[PDB]
Every structure is written in C-alpha cells, then in structure tokens.
Amino acid sequence: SVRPVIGSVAPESLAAQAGLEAGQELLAVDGEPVTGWNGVNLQLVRRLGESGTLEVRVQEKGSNVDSTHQVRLDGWLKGEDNPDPIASLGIRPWRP
Amino acid sequence: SVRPVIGSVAPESLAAQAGLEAGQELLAVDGEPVTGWNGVNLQLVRRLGESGTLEVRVQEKGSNVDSTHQVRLDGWLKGEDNPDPIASLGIRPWRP
C-alpha cells in the first residue's frame, strides 16, 4: 500500500488546527499502527460522531522526527450518512 | 448525495458472481439503506474478515425493479490491514 503521506492540508481545517502538515507521513491513529490510507480510514470510522481527541502520530519528511497530534473531535461528522473521513479532516493524500 | 451506481464490475469478481452489474443503483447493504458510496463503505467495513453473505439490494437502471444479491464472503479480506472494500468486490463506483 502507498505510504500515507499528507499531500495538502486545507486552511483552518481540523488537521491544520492540530498541526498536521503536507509532507508528514502517518504512522499511527488512536494508538494503532497504520501503513496506508485504507487502514487510516478504518481507524477514523471508529470515531464517527464522537467528541474528544483523535491521536495522529506522524513523521516528518526525510527525518526520524516523530510527533503526536491531537485532532479535535466535536460531534465529528455526527448525523452524516455519507461521510468522507479523511477529507473531512482537511487532508488530501499525496498521490503522485 | 450522488446516488451509488455501479460503474463497472470486473469479470469473475465477487460482485459479478453475485449478479451485480454496471448501471445498477444500490439501495441497501445488509438491510440498511444507502444513498451514497461513502455510506456503502461504512456497511462493508462491518463485514471485514467474515464469512457468509453480504446482502446488496439494487434497482435496475431506468426501472423500478429491485433485486437482492447475495455476495459470497469467504474470509473476505481477512487480516488485511489496508482493505479497499468496494474495489475488492470488483466494483468501480460510477462518477458523474
């Protein structure tokens, strides 16, 4: 699976407000390892409608510097029948 | 919401073997109504790794004939960390 690298982050999005950035590679979501956007999505689905924090561990491009970001969930996608979890965070996967 | 219409079905896929066809509109998955491919995906995720039948109710293109198709699950995507549920059935969603 394509490694899960952020291609862009929408201004003022949940991801931006949490300090996620283009070029970061996701390594874990809510404490469980991820190695592709499909696995990311499975972790995101588990939190639909919830409030609290979504923990996203990432690594900077080209370094071993890891950081953990707390994305704010406030009834996140509550009531949505057709949610797009990754896009709703403001994240566009890098897909060259 | 963009109604969930099948764009293509790969030959010999799980969807093909169950009688699903391009042009059919999904109405329900495992008994629950769907109105877009994102909601379809939420229903598919619930069955990952399972065996039995995935019930897919569709409407024929241009008609009101509804039919229920039993897609065969045999350890479907068991263990896979990065599953693509819709694609794994052989289906490409139709895009406007």
Tab-separated table of C-alpha atoms in Angstrom:
chain	number	residue	atom	x	y	z
A	1	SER	CA	0.000	0.000	0.000
A	2	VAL	CA	1.100	3.544	-0.765
A	3	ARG	CA	2.678	5.059	2.303
A	4	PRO	CA	0.248	7.517	3.888
A	5	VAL	CA	1.765	10.936	3.266
A	6	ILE	CA	-0.215	14.152	3.516
A	7	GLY	CA	-0.207	15.981	0.203
A	8	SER	CA	-2.091	19.061	1.334
A	9	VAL	CA	-3.999	20.373	4.337
A	10	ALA	CA	-6.934	22.712	3.905
A	11	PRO	CA	-6.543	26.042	5.743
A	12	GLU	CA	-8.368	26.211	9.088
A	13	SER	CA	-9.256	22.515	8.907
A	14	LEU	CA	-9.222	20.128	11.845
A	15	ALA	CA	-5.875	18.805	10.599
A	16	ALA	CA	-4.385	22.288	10.257
A	17	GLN	CA	-5.543	23.271	13.726
A	18	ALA	CA	-3.850	20.156	15.097
A	19	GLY	CA	-0.516	20.940	13.443
A	20	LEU	CA	-0.649	18.385	10.656
A	21	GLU	CA	1.234	19.409	7.546
A	22	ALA	CA	1.934	18.429	3.983
A	23	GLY	CA	4.856	16.035	3.848
A	24	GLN	CA	4.095	14.294	7.125
A	25	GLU	CA	3.708	10.518	6.999
A	26	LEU	CA	1.085	8.971	9.267
A	27	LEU	CA	2.398	6.174	11.476
A	28	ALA	CA	-0.450	5.538	13.932
A	29	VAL	CA	-4.015	6.632	14.582
A	30	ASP	CA	-5.520	6.295	18.062
A	31	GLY	CA	-2.532	4.240	19.130
A	32	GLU	CA	-2.666	1.631	16.395
A	33	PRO	CA	-0.197	1.441	13.536
A	34	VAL	CA	-1.183	2.441	10.036
A	35	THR	CA	0.692	1.789	6.807
A	36	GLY	CA	-1.826	3.051	4.247
A	37	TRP	CA	-4.752	5.394	3.881
A	38	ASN	CA	-7.159	2.443	3.839
A	39	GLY	CA	-6.018	1.473	7.331
A	40	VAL	CA	-6.199	5.107	8.389
A	41	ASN	CA	-9.815	5.162	7.261
A	42	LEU	CA	-10.687	2.105	9.360
A	43	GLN	CA	-9.378	3.859	12.476
A	44	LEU	CA	-11.246	7.066	11.593
A	45	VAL	CA	-14.568	5.267	11.118
A	46	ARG	CA	-14.399	4.046	14.720
A	47	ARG	CA	-14.669	7.652	15.957
A	48	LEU	CA	-17.559	8.923	13.803
A	49	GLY	CA	-19.943	11.079	15.808
A	50	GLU	CA	-17.634	11.216	18.813
A	51	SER	CA	-16.124	14.001	20.850
A	52	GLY	CA	-12.653	14.037	22.323
A	53	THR	CA	-9.328	13.661	20.579
A	54	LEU	CA	-8.130	11.722	17.576
A	55	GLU	CA	-4.460	10.919	18.152
A	56	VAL	CA	-2.367	11.055	14.994
A	57	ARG	CA	1.327	10.104	15.166
A	58	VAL	CA	3.378	11.284	12.205
A	59	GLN	CA	6.935	11.580	10.952
A	60	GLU	CA	8.439	14.497	9.083
A	61	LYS	CA	9.595	14.005	5.522
A	62	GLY	CA	13.203	12.816	5.401
A	63	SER	CA	13.753	12.634	9.164
A	64	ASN	CA	13.127	10.327	12.100
A	65	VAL	CA	11.388	13.164	13.968
A	66	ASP	CA	8.014	11.834	15.127
A	67	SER	CA	5.239	13.925	16.650
A	68	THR	CA	1.798	13.161	18.043
A	69	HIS	CA	-1.061	15.475	17.163
A	70	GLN	CA	-4.436	15.702	18.848
A	71	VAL	CA	-7.188	16.390	16.329
A	72	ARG	CA	-10.268	17.862	17.992
A	73	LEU	CA	-13.473	15.848	17.639
A	74	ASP	CA	-16.677	17.776	18.344
A	75	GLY	CA	-19.546	15.531	17.345
A	76	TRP	CA	-17.333	14.794	14.350
A	77	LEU	CA	-19.463	14.023	11.266
A	78	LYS	CA	-22.433	13.381	13.560
A	79	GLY	CA	-25.528	12.559	11.546
A	80	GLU	CA	-23.739	12.323	8.210
A	81	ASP	CA	-24.906	9.368	6.121
A	82	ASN	CA	-22.079	9.586	3.562
A	83	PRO	CA	-19.009	10.785	5.469
A	84	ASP	CA	-15.585	11.096	3.820
A	85	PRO	CA	-13.445	10.833	6.960
A	86	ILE	CA	-10.002	11.746	5.597
A	87	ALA	CA	-11.294	14.650	3.510
A	88	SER	CA	-13.365	15.923	6.440
A	89	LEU	CA	-10.161	16.456	8.404
A	90	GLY	CA	-8.861	18.669	5.626
A	91	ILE	CA	-6.327	16.100	4.403
A	92	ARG	CA	-5.636	15.292	0.775
A	93	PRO	CA	-3.440	12.171	0.450
A	94	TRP	CA	-0.260	12.540	-1.601
A	95	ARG	CA	-0.832	10.531	-4.765
A	96	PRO	CA	1.744	11.454	-7.448
B	1	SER	CA	-25.841	12.863	-2.439
B	2	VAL	CA	-24.518	11.205	-5.599
B	3	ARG	CA	-26.588	8.072	-5.871
B	4	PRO	CA	-24.447	4.895	-5.652
B	5	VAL	CA	-24.481	3.460	-9.158
B	6	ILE	CA	-22.121	0.691	-10.218
B	7	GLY	CA	-19.705	1.952	-12.872
B	8	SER	CA	-18.004	-1.330	-13.671
B	9	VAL	CA	-17.858	-4.899	-12.418
B	10	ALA	CA	-14.677	-6.872	-13.006
B	11	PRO	CA	-15.245	-10.267	-14.666
B	12	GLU	CA	-15.294	-13.222	-12.234
B	13	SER	CA	-15.333	-10.877	-9.228
B	14	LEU	CA	-17.430	-11.430	-6.121
B	15	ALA	CA	-19.876	-8.832	-7.437
B	16	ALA	CA	-20.051	-10.407	-10.901
B	17	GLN	CA	-20.655	-13.870	-9.480
B	18	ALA	CA	-23.490	-12.463	-7.383
B	19	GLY	CA	-25.224	-10.930	-10.414
B	20	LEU	CA	-24.340	-7.303	-9.797
B	21	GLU	CA	-23.954	-5.250	-12.959
B	22	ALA	CA	-22.893	-1.859	-14.194
B	23	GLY	CA	-25.763	0.599	-14.107
B	24	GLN	CA	-27.490	-0.846	-11.060
B	25	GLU	CA	-28.142	1.562	-8.205
B	26	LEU	CA	-27.504	0.333	-4.690
B	27	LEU	CA	-30.428	0.825	-2.325
B	28	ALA	CA	-29.385	-1.080	0.784
B	29	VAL	CA	-26.481	-3.101	2.120
B	30	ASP	CA	-27.084	-5.739	4.798
B	31	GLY	CA	-30.577	-4.378	5.224
B	32	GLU	CA	-29.638	-0.756	5.838
B	33	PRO	CA	-30.469	1.966	3.333
B	34	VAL	CA	-27.659	3.650	1.466
B	35	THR	CA	-27.707	6.874	-0.513
B	36	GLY	CA	-24.031	7.183	-1.485
B	37	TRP	CA	-20.869	5.146	-1.862
B	38	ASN	CA	-19.474	6.545	1.389
B	39	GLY	CA	-22.398	5.052	3.293
B	40	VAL	CA	-21.962	1.813	1.365
B	41	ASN	CA	-18.375	1.703	2.592
B	42	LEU	CA	-19.459	2.028	6.227
B	43	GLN	CA	-21.684	-1.027	5.820
B	44	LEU	CA	-18.936	-3.004	4.043
B	45	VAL	CA	-16.369	-2.334	6.777
B	46	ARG	CA	-18.609	-4.066	9.318
B	47	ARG	CA	-18.156	-7.389	7.496
B	48	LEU	CA	-14.371	-7.384	7.026
B	49	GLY	CA	-12.868	-10.818	7.613
B	50	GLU	CA	-16.250	-12.531	7.782
B	51	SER	CA	-17.880	-15.443	6.019
B	52	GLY	CA	-21.494	-15.646	4.953
B	53	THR	CA	-23.418	-13.334	2.671
B	54	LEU	CA	-23.300	-9.634	2.026
B	55	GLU	CA	-26.819	-8.606	1.029
B	56	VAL	CA	-26.838	-5.952	-1.680
B	57	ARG	CA	-30.237	-4.648	-2.769
B	58	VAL	CA	-30.224	-2.770	-6.072
B	59	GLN	CA	-32.539	-1.137	-8.556
B	60	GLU	CA	-32.085	-1.830	-12.259
B	61	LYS	CA	-31.064	1.154	-14.368
B	62	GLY	CA	-34.053	3.045	-15.685
B	63	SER	CA	-36.583	0.847	-13.884
B	64	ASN	CA	-38.185	0.205	-10.501
B	65	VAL	CA	-37.237	-3.486	-10.495
B	66	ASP	CA	-35.423	-4.126	-7.217
B	67	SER	CA	-33.338	-7.262	-6.668
B	68	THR	CA	-31.340	-8.551	-3.721
B	69	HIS	CA	-27.965	-10.095	-4.448
B	70	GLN	CA	-26.055	-12.305	-2.045
B	71	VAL	CA	-22.339	-11.606	-2.392
B	72	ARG	CA	-20.296	-14.520	-1.069
B	73	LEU	CA	-17.942	-13.750	1.819
B	74	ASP	CA	-15.276	-16.396	2.471
B	75	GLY	CA	-12.846	-14.940	4.994
B	76	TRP	CA	-13.266	-11.760	2.987
B	77	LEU	CA	-10.131	-9.592	3.278
B	78	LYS	CA	-9.265	-11.439	6.492
B	79	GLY	CA	-6.261	-9.906	8.229
B	80	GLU	CA	-5.715	-7.208	5.605
B	81	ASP	CA	-4.516	-4.022	7.162
B	82	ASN	CA	-5.328	-1.754	4.186
B	83	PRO	CA	-8.526	-3.146	2.664
B	84	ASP	CA	-10.347	-1.390	-0.178
B	85	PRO	CA	-13.797	-2.831	0.410
B	86	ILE	CA	-15.670	-1.708	-2.707
B	87	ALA	CA	-12.785	-2.465	-5.077
B	88	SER	CA	-12.278	-5.880	-3.501
B	89	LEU	CA	-15.787	-6.847	-4.639
B	90	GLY	CA	-14.852	-5.983	-8.210
B	91	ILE	CA	-16.803	-2.710	-8.277
B	92	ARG	CA	-15.764	0.688	-9.538
B	93	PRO	CA	-18.300	3.343	-8.454
B	94	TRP	CA	-19.817	5.408	-11.230
B	95	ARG	CA	-18.678	9.023	-11.211
B	96	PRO	CA	-20.721	11.845	-12.710
